[PDB]
Amino acid sequence: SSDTPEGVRSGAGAVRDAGGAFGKKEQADEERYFRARAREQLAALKKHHENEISHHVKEIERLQKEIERHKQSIKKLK
Amino acid sequence: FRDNGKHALIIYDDLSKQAVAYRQMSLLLRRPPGREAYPGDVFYLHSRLLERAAKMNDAFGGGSLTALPVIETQAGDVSAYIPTNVISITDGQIFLETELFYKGIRPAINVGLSVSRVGSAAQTRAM
């Protein structure tokens, strides 16, 4: 068939357009591999140091408010 | 221009819209249909138009006429009715694909399926 212009010839991207067994085995392998790359690129994206400082403080502020509460409690009791 | 010793070129853009404008005239005149509702003489419509292209000799003037028809396929199927009439009349085809057009090859001529049966006898000695 293919050894003439008349007969049917296959192009590029014909395993996914069929939608069979190999067309489903290819979609679940591009997803189960690029799911782990959304893990390693997101875990190392938390290693920004400026965010950790900001978080060094939010916590600090929270703790200082607790201290403020306690100090008021003492004031009352006294 | 062929009768008076000169040279010429003609381009039909396109011949696949002449077989459709002729099918409508047939089926409204109540003629017997055929494959894909084309009449029995659509081969005789395109043959006597392309056979008028000829290379005359020196005793008649030495003129010429060159013909380039354009044919639009559907989904790359050249085995239809009109893409097989005009293929068997002419000499060679230039097959422009759509896959090579987006892969960067522009003009997207496929040289695997393109032929010419005058061969190398129309090239200059340098080329």
UniProtKB/Swiss-Prot annotation, chain A:
Q: Where is it located?
A: Mitochondrion
Q: At the top level of its lineage, which domain of life is listed?
A: Eukaryota
Query: What does the UniProt keyword field contain?
Result: Coiled coil, Mitochondrion, Transit peptide
Where does the record place the region Antiparallel alpha-helical coiled coil region? Answer: 49-78
GO biological process: what's one of them? positive regulation of mitochondrial outer membrane permeabilization involved in apoptotic signaling pathway
- Residues the record lists as N6-succinyllysine modifications: K78
Q: Where is this region: N-terminal inhibitory region?
A: 1-27
Quote one Gene Ontology molecular function term.
Answer: identical protein binding
The residues forming a coiled coil are: 44-78
List the GO terms this entry assigns under cellular component, sorted alphabetically. cell surface; cytoplasm; mitochondrion; protein-containing complex
Ranges for region Disordered = 1-23
Family to which this protein belongs? Belongs to the ATPase inhibitor family.
What information about domains appears in the record's comments?
Forms an alpha-helical dimer with monomers associated via an antiparallel alpha-helical coiled coil composed of residues 74-106, leaving each N-terminal inhibitory region (residues 26-52) accessible for interaction with an F1 catalytic domain. The inhibitory N-terminal region (residues 26-52) binds the alpha(ADP-bound)-beta(ADP-bound) (ATP5F1A-ATP5F1B) interface of F1-ATPase, and also contact the central gamma subunit (ATP5F1C).
Q: How does it assemble?
A: Homodimer; represents the active form and is present at a pH value below 6.5. Homotetramer; represents the inactive form and is present at a pH value above 7.0.
**Job of this protein:** Endogenous F(1)F(o)-ATPase inhibitor limiting ATP depletion when the mitochondrial membrane potential falls below a threshold and the F(1)F(o)-ATP synthase starts hydrolyzing ATP to pump protons out of the mitochondrial matrix. Required to avoid the consumption of cellular ATP when the F(1)F(o)-ATP synthase enzyme acts as an ATP hydrolase. Indirectly acts as a regulator of heme synthesis in erythroid tissues: regulates heme synthesis by modulating the mitochondrial pH and redox potential, allowing FECH to efficiently catalyze the incorporation of iron into protoporphyrin IX to produce heme.
Protein name as annotated = ATPase inhibitor, mitochondrial
Give the stretch of the parent protein shown, with its full length: 26 to 103 of 108
Curated annotation (Swiss-Prot), chain B:
Organism, by scientific name, is Sus scrofa
Required for activity, annotated site positions: S114
- PTM annotation (N6-acetyllysine): residues: K6
What's the subunit arrangement here? Homotrimer. Component of the ATP synthase complex composed at least of ATP5F1A/subunit alpha, ATP5F1B/subunit beta, ATP5MC1/subunit c (homooctomer), MT-ATP6/subunit a, MT-ATP8/subunit 8, ATP5ME/subunit e, ATP5MF/subunit f, ATP5MG/subunit g, ATP5MK/subunit k, ATP5MJ/subunit j, ATP5F1C/subunit gamma, ATP5F1D/subunit delta, ATP5F1E/subunit epsilon, ATP5PF/subunit F6, ATP5PB/subunit b, ATP5PD/subunit d, ATP5PO/subunit OSCP.
Binding of Mg(2+) occurs at: D13
| Stretch of the intact protein here | 300 to 426 of 553
**Cited function:** Subunit alpha, of the mitochondrial membrane ATP synthase complex (F(1)F(0) ATP synthase or Complex V) that produces ATP from ADP in the presence of a proton gradient across the membrane which is generated by electron transport complexes of the respiratory chain. ATP synthase complex consist of a soluble F(1) head domain - the catalytic core - and a membrane F(1) domain - the membrane proton channel. These two domains are linked by a central stalk rotating inside the F(1) region and a stationary peripheral stalk.
Name the family: Belongs to the ATPase alpha/beta chains family.
Q: What is this protein called?
A: ATP synthase F(1) complex subunit alpha, mitochondrial
Where do transmembrane segments lie in this chain? none
Location in the cell:
Mitochondrion; Mitochondrion inner membrane; Cell membrane
| Domain of life of the organism encoding this protein | Eukaryota
Q: What else is known?
A: The siderophore enterobactin (Ent) produced by enteric bacteria binds Fe(3+) and helps bacteria scavenge iron ions from the environment. As a consequence, the mammalian siderocalin LCN2 plays an important role in defense against bacterial infections by sequestering iron bound to microbial siderophores. LCN2 can also bind iron bound to endogenous or nutrient-derived iron chelators and plays an important role in cellular iron homeostasis.
Q: Which residues carry this modification: N6-succinyllysine?
A: K6
